[PDB]
Amino acid sequence: KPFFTRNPSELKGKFIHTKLRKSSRGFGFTVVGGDEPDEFLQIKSLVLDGPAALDGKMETGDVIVSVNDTCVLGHTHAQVVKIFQSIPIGASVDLELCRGYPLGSSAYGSVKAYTNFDAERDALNIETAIKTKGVDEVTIVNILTNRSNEQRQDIAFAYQRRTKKELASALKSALSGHLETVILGLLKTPAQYDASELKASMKGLGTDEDSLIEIICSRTNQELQEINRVYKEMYKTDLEKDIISDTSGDFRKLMVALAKGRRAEDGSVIDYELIDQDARDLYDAGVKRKGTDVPKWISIMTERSVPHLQKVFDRYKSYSPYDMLESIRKEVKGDLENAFLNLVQCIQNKPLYFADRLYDSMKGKGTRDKVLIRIMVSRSEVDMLKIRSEFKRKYGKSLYYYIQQDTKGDYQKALLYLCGGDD
């Protein structure tokens, strides 16, 4: 139940006022909202080379508070769009916008966008900490870990305007150890951070197969489509090329198929007949006959939608004495097995999958900091609340507790801020 009100005095964000005159192609932005009884009308997007964007005051996620001295808090979608359309070309409109209530936010992340956001303020305070004799990592950790990734991008731009030096380079020189790894990962976008880890897993002639399997098997179509574009712009090489160069056999086929991000979107109606047939094919290709038909497994597990495959794996238990996970361990082995096991976990329960990976990175001597840092950074704005839920439900204690006992220093503080308290 998102926040909503029709009295402007009860809003928490900041207020901005713009005055836009309509051009030939409108005001140059998209309005979203006004569906459910209490939906705020929010700025969906901007149109660059347009009246609203060239003004610069309007940004996405903004909430419309007043249109030409008439409050629209609570007005339906069709009412506020007829206002903008009744305006003639050349006439000016006065928009009051509130910045603080976000859009496109996952309700299951642990780190939320700062309500009283100020990019120039945080850029100044971080500069101070960098040049502080001793580096106030405390300040740097308190700021960046309590900002959203898009807010952190605005910190880097504001820091570059006032210092002419990129924040990633300045923080790479003043920090050290695992704390440097976490901060540099938080500064990158989700696509930039995943693309960098993928290249790192394929550096050298060897391959970190675990990091490659984790990212490829757990990312959706939209995330993979953005990673492929960013990876090609960063390293001048398509991700599929470096995957072929560092993988082979059926393992290569599976990773190439998954990395395409062309999995079928979830259909409106449930295909119960295809659910039964896909289960029969998975059983006839593996446990029933001797050997294994790996291509048939790759086709079904990569092309079908996630909700469909969930019902497929449940129907698979009707044909096979072993479930999908136990079938994988018996039929295939090696890198192909680890990739299939990771894929099925992400389909059945992805938050549970990241919980086990977190527990595996800390249960033994030392800490697999590479796996622990990547998960706490990439899933912080996605499903961290669900991972914490599945974690304490299974392991009794909280994820905050395990990070506490396996990490120390500011590196511990940074990861605890990304967790969001003990469950």
Partner: peptide
């Protein structure tokens, strides 16, 4: 899918 209007 979600009610959107080009303004």
């Amino acid at each position: 899918t979600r009610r959107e209007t080009e303004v």
